[PDB]
């Protein structure tokens, strides 16, 4: 009968969505995690969730619906998006051929509208007992992360362990975010690595959030890990031919206070130092950005902020570490920064103030030349308006590399405590402890008192949003690796 | 192409090729070929309207989309398609304003009790057609011709929507030559033009027969795989009931490029039914072949992407319909295809 | 344990794959007059040029190697093309996932690198017992006819009795080769159509070969045996270019620089009365390299004749009234087999030469009420969505949509030439000659009938360079 036949149906789906997460949070209990589907409720928009593949089931024959994963689509603040989840209570949440096509369907349905994909990863790692089988679906959905990249905006969180075949789709998106305490990622699990090491030590948030790289981020809790990724969607287009959101804005016609301390933030000392955080927060709207990399190459900032309303990201050298010299992690996490926002049409604002490369054997031996000329290429290569704004030190390659006017900029305008230079105190072994020579020769745009940056960035900005640039014919470019 | 006269002769070659050909009762008639000739050289004696009047090409040769009762019925027929229509192949179609309301309604719980109990009972797709459809209301292409299958235009939440859906009052819903070649062109023209398909799957397969044989179903009939395989425009596939063999898979199957597809609890699919228990073993293995009467095993595979229950259609399928406004799909490279003729 | 053992093993595995499964198959296949898969392949592939993919392919939960399908690439006369060969004896060729993925396999390489694919089809459709999963894998090799129609070629050899998807895919692809005797198609066979409708019928009447060549224009050619049908595919691919971009073949020609014996009977072949006909054929042979053609169609419509020959090596696509069936008329089935072929042939850049000798349409009831005006439209419409040159010779009657529609100078011709004899004009009721045409430019030359193949390789040679544009847009929407 029909109805018995409606009946079923329900009972099928309390059985996949009700008793399963009943199951599945008395299993995260034992580790202090939500369940995957409190994740998903949690990112997107309240009611907006339409689930796809709930009654996907393995071939084999214990075969629960899912096998493993949550998969569909909703919102977040009003604009579409992809997500799935892993649950790991499930076969640990290692990947199966089931699972592996409902994030496969959820992929290629994001690449198809143009929308972006949020990964909530939770997995073992790949499912042993499905052979080669759980390997093809690995590198299935990591190809698909490839031709996504540049695309559609690709963002990871680990709210989990994340080892073996779970570290390459992560490690392909845009963005990976991990959660303090819950989660790992290596390679190689602790246990053959035999040697003497915890998982934490190994691949705990710490490490890839300020020694390898790999984390973009770590959220105290699995809310602030969410509540970041909502807050980077929010500067980001769906896709790389759709504009960014554009907001409105509470902005000054003239001159503030906050405007004129630019006129005293620089020191009267060249010793001394300043934070490179109080230019950003006096030109952009509201004093507010998100940072990137925040714990990773603090000599760096990577952000991204707004400037009357519209998205603009911003690469700042910080004189409060290591002088605001650039090194190897500076350069990397500097370089894939812009190389994405130009991807998706984001305008770059450089502030500079560079005093050259940190020196050392190990600089050399681990390679600043081929990891160093990235950051050099990422600038090269854009097309996105880039406007660069010269507060202090000026020399040499450091100041061809950070946004200069040969490299690309459309816009250079120099504070008067900048000093463009092939070199400081150095080469005798207020000549040059200005910007008039640059000037002199157009290398610099602008001259101007601090207190006007707010305002003449601004107008830049605007003057430039119809910008375009012709870029090469040819399959891809072949930046150093 | 309104032909509000006679139309005979090389004056019937503009008409066929343009997309719809609206003829009006009485005054109007089209033939290759006059009956005075058909009498010279056949020795039959024919009139105009036994040769080629409107009933003859709205229900026999399918030549004609719509008959107007008169000039007036002829002319604003044309007026609403229009406005459903773009004006060309790049510009968008209206967007209306909507009253559809968030909410489960009276009219989406009949659906839940619209399927009948019993196989040997049917029922009136339009009823489930008007139930998701703005105001239940729907422009229908080829009303006439072919029965056994309904194209239409409509519109959910103001925008047009094209709907092909199979239609078990009339030949069991089945799949025939012209049931095939009266959906087939409608959703090549829909794709051409932007429109997205929402197909409701009841089928049992194509016709089988002597007389479908040789008039060339297979050439014929599979005219429409090419067209949904080809179409690049959103496709919603809302499956009711049967979804046997090949009528599962031109209907707007996942594997021939839908973008949704929702069954629901009284969905079955299958190759075939009890035909099946005989080319497999030369009656209890017969209702052990109702692995098959349900949604569930193209559900585990991924084939469907929900089973819901039937009064969440419409509002699933708007749901759907909103995401998938920004599809782009990339299309082969050639000068045009090859369609079967 | 030792790598010796391990290739050991391969080759043992090689064996039974290849070796004797053959055997259990010319077993079977024998007994009822067919060849095997393989040995299909081999006729129809040069010699060694055989790459089997997929050859360890098995199902998953007897599972015999292949899963029912012999797949792979090799060339025919020296260029590259991919194929499928079901193999009927494993489950009655029936499509599971393996054999399915083998055939999506070699399409996808196809389509990859621009080869035609030719499939071998002895096959019961898709496999009931795999549910929905054997549905949708043909369904995916339908998606991927679709993708190539006008991309790749794409030949069907029907070697067997084929029902459901076996019939639903050729019929995709652009040519459908039967053999006799052996090889039938249906959406259905004759038992389920007794136990279902009531309908007592043998296969033959259901859909043997002589059904769809003649009957229903299914199938493009008939084979003596399975080598006849073999030698037609292969001479068939040697006409055409590999994909839609390279060009097609070209072979040296012996041409006579010349007027010769054989272009002067041209000037007595068109009959003193009107009454009386001649065979186009004739006319055709002596514009041809060497008065040779391979016939599309040959029994179905036989009121049109579509054929490929070649002028000074080229390919060129025949077109042309043949007044020794219906006096010549167009009808609902030489528009459709005449239609295709020009799309067919406009899609892979063959350039077409229409003779003309067209008195009218046939009348009666039947061709109005099966739509002759929706399906005979058809070829007007290929015609003029045609860019590839166009040559038209007019051999005599030239009468109102006939004249218009077989390749005038208004729907799109290059070169429209006339002989003394075509009589163009909007009926027959003088008017009875070409010069009111001629004085309009409608048509381009008036010429004797002997200068015909002159003056069609002077032209063919003269738009080779042809370019047309095209509209902008997804696609047509053609009749259908
Ligand atoms: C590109 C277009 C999209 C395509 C969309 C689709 O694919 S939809 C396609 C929908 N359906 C189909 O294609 C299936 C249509 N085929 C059939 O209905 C039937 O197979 C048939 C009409 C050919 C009848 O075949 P027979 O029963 O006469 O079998 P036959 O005597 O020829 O030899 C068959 C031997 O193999 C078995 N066999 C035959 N066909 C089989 C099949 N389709 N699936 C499983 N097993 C089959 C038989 O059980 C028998 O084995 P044993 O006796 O040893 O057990």
Not at chain 1, 84 to 110: C, P, Q, R, W
Not at chain 1, 365 to 387: C, D, M, N, W
Not at chain 2, 113 to 129: G, N, R
Request: charged residues 20%.
């Amino acid at each position: 009968s029909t109805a018995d036949r409606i009946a079923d149906l329900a009972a099928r789906h309390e059985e996949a969505v009700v008793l399963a997460e009943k199951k599945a949070a008395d299993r995260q209990h034992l580790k202090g995690k939500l369940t995957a589907r409190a994740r998903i409720d949690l990112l997107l928009d309240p009611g907006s969730f339409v689930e796809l593949d709930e009654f996907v089931r393995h071939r084999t024959v214990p075969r629960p619906y899912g096998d493993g994963v949550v998969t569909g689509h909703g919102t977040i603040d009003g604009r579409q998006v992809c997500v799935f989840s892993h649950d790991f209570t499930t076969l640990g949440g290692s990947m199966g051929e089931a699972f592996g096509s409902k994030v496969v369907k959820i992929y290629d349905f994001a690449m198809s509208v143009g929308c972006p994909v949020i990964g909530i990863n939770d997995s073992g790692g790949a499912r042993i007992q499905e052979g080669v089988m759980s390997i093809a679906y690995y590198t299935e959905l990591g190809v698909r992360n490839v031709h996504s990249s540049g695309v559609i905006p690709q963002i990871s969180l680990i709210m989990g362990p994340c080892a073996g075949g779970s570290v390459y789709s992560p490690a392909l998106t845009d963005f990976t975010v991990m959660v303090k305490d819950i989660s790992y990622m290596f390679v190689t699990g602790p246990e053959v690595v035999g040697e003497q090491v915890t998982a934490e030590q190994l691949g705990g948030p710490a490490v890839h959030a300020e020694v390898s790289g790999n984390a973009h981020y770590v959220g105290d809790d699995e809310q602030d890990a969410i509540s970041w990724v909502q807050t980077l969607l929010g500067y980001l287009p769906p896709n790389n031919l759709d504009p960014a959101p554009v907001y409105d804005h509470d902005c000054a016609p003239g001159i503030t206070e906050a405007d004129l301390a630019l006129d005293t933030v620089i020191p009267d000392s060249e010793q001394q130092v300043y934070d490179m955080a109080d230019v950003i927060t006096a030109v952009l709207d509201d004093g507010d950005y998100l940072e990137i990399h925040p714990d990773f190459a603090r000599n760096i900032i990577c952000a991204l902020g707004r400037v009357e309303g519209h998205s603009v990201a911003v690469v700042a050298n910080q004189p409060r570490h290591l002088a605001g010299v650039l090194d190897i992690d500076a350069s990397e996490k500097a370089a894939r920064f812009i190389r994405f926002c130009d991807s998706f049409n984001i305008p770059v604002l450089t502030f500079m103030d560079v005093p050259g490369y940190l020196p050392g054997v190990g600089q050399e031996h681990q390679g600043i030349i081929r990891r160093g000329i990235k950051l050099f290429y990422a600038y090269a290569e854009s097309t996105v308006p880039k406007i660069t704004v010269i507060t202090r030190k000026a020399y040499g390659g450091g100041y061809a590399v950070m946004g200069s006017r040969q490299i690309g900029a459309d816009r250079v305008m120099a504070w008067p405590t900048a000093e463009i230079a092939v070199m400081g105190a150095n080469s005798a072994v207020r000549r040059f402890g200005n910007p008039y020579e640059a000037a002199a020769h157009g290398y610099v745009d602008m001259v101007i008192s601090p207190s006007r940056t707010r305002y003449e960035v601004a107008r830049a900005l605007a003057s430039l949003r119809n910008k375009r640039q012709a870029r090469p014919a040819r399959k891809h470019g072949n930046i150093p690796l | 192409s309104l032909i509000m006269g006679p139309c005979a002769g090389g004056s019937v070659y503009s008409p066929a090729l343009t997309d719809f050909t609206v003829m009006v009762k009485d005054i109007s008639y089209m033939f290759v070929t006059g009956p005075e000739v058909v009498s010279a050289v056949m020795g039959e004696q024919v009139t105009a309207e036994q040769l080629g009047g409107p009933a003859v090409h709205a229900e026999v040769s399918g030549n004609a989309h719509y008959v107007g009762d008169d000039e007036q019925d002829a002319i604003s027929w044309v007026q609403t398609l229009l406005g459903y229509l773009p004006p060309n192949n790049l510009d968008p179609a209206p967007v209306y304003d909507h009253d559809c309301a968030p909410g489960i309604t009276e009219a989406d719980l009949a659906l839940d009790t619209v399927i009948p109990d019993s196989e040997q009972q049917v029922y009136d797709m339009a009823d489930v057609i008007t139930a998701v459809l703005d105001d239940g209301d729907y422009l229908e292409i080829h009303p006439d011709f072919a029965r056994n299958i309904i194209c239409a235009l409509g519109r959910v939440e103001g925008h047009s929507v094209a709907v092909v859906a199979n239609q078990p009052r009339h030949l069991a819903g089945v799949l025939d030559i012209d049931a095939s070649e009266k959906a087939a062109r409608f959703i090549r023209f829909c794709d051409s033009f932007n429109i997205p398909v929402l197909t409701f799957m009841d089928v049992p397969g194509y016709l089988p027969g002597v007389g479908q044989e040789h008039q060339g179903i297979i050439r014929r009939g599979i005219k429409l795989f090419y067209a949904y395989a080809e179409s690049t425009v959103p496709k919603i596939t809302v499956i009711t009931r049967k979804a046997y063999g090949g009528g599962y898979a031109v209907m707007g199957s996942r594997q021939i490029g839908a973008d949704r597809v929702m069954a629901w609890p009284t969905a079955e699919i299958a190759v075939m039914g009890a035909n099946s228990a005989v080319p497999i073993l030369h009656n209890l293995v017969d209702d052990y072949r109702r692995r098959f009467g349900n949604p569930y095993e193209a559900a585990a595979h991924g084939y469907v992407d929900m089973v819901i229950s039937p009064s969440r259609t419409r509002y699933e399928v708007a749901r759907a319909l909103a995401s998938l406004r920004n599809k782009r799909q990339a299309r082969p490279a050639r000068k045009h295809g090859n369609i079967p003729l």
